[PDB]
Design a protein around this ligand. Structure first.
Ligand SMILES: [Zn+2]
Length: 106
């Protein structure tokens, strides 16, 4: 039963990650025309993350505003800059609400 429960737990997390990836894919496709819908998809992905206790894929972790949850598109509603005085890092500013997010470049 230990192995069975472990397999089910692992598969459930994989499913959660699969769903999150799909929701962000849809968010990106509808974001430019329907930003409110993209925000909804981002939030559904965040709900799954919370319920399954999983991490958002690397390819999507920086693509939404942690404050307002809008899907971020450089030039449209996001400013992306790099700072290197100390640790090189990416500075992403949500232009819709002004929230600033930083990520390691390396
Ligand atoms: Zn924002």
């Amino acid at each position: 039963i230990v192995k069975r429960r472990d397999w089910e737990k692992k598969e459930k997390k994989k499913i959660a990650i699969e769903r999150i990836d799909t929701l962000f894919t849809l968010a990106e496709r509808v974001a430019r025309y329907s930003p409110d819908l993209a925000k909804r998809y981002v939030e559904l992905a965040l709900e799954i993350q919370k319920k399954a206790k999983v991490k958002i894929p690397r390819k999507w972790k920086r693509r939404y505003c942690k404050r307002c949850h809008t899907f971020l598109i450089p030039g449209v509603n996001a400013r992306v800059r790099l700072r290197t005085k100390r640790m090189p890092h990416v500075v992403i500013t949500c232009l819709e609400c002004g929230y600033i997010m930083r990520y390691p470049y390396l």
